[PDB]
Design a protein around this ligand. Sequence first.
Ligand code: FE
Ligand code: FE
Lengths: 202, 202
Amino acid sequence: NNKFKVKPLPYAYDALEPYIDKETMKLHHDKHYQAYVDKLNAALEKYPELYNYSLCELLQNLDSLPKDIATTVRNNAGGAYNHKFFFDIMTPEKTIPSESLKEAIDRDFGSFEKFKQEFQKSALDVFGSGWAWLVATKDGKLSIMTTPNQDSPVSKNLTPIIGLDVWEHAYYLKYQNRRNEYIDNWFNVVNWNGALENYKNL
Amino acid sequence: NNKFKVKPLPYAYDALEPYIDKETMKLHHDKHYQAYVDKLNAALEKYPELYNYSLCELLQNLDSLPKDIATTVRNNAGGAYNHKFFFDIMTPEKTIPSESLKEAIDRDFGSFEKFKQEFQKSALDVFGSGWAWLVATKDGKLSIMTTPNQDSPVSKNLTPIIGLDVWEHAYYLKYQNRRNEYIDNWFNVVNWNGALENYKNL
Ligand SMILES: [Fe+3]
Ligand SMILES: [Fe+3]
């Protein structure tokens, strides 16, 4: 069975309290993330060789996939990739920026505080469903960008370093309309060591 | 003061229980709808003559508004118009299709049940944030369509007859990921008399 699979949550479902509630972690991982994976697998039954593509390969070739599944793959491979990435980029452990990522942030944004203010504003300003990202070009230059729905920077040859889900399902149970509070609290759980590994993998 | 205003909810905040929870009615009307109106008013301070346009006129002329506010008006006039419409199209009173709207539904969909199945599927399939609509052309022909985010059929010269908000804020507190249950339950509160008036106003 080479079908796509849901990666088990890398920590306990209540591990990110009180910043993200356990009930939301359960729904977000066990229902939403699961649905993207199930729908993706369903769409590829017609073209089983695509089970041998990685999620990244699917996202990098949306415009050359067979026409009848291009959109469903964009949405569901997007959802699967983004959520796996998102749960991996959070942690109950205490972490801080270090090494080349720490330096790159200062280089490209001036300081960590300036980077943080820009990321928070970009996340706050996403209209509708979507994501805010810290991304790197192939040469390691950092920038902040957003994507709508489950679109991914990977599709634009940009490599995600950290990313924040601002679909309302990600924050409504605890924060309701107060997305600003969700965004601010999320920085307490960002896994900077994972972010560093993402940056090093260029 | 000719600024745009939030229309007071046309019934008690708990009037739509148990189909839509009181807490959601409060947030949806007092926070989300309010924010669209506030942001719209803010954007028009630079062009105060636009306070004399109706919301419909704004939505019908997005591509000819001054370039610097076109997008913010699309989103926020959209939000203001759509929510006023949405709260108006629900009621705690019992209503059923009648008169020309009842006949048009049978004419254009075959039966009410066929109309309902199509509407429910369209609402379920909206990906990301958006709306499902029953709309009419100027000549009274009915169809079902969806819009993303706060885009409106009005901008495409289609007249909304009923419409359902499927942004996650509209259903997450009570239904979480189970949008299907929200959609099915919503038909208990559709105001068919209001829908008839919408259809007659062509
Ligand atoms: Fe999500
Ligand atoms: Fe809404």
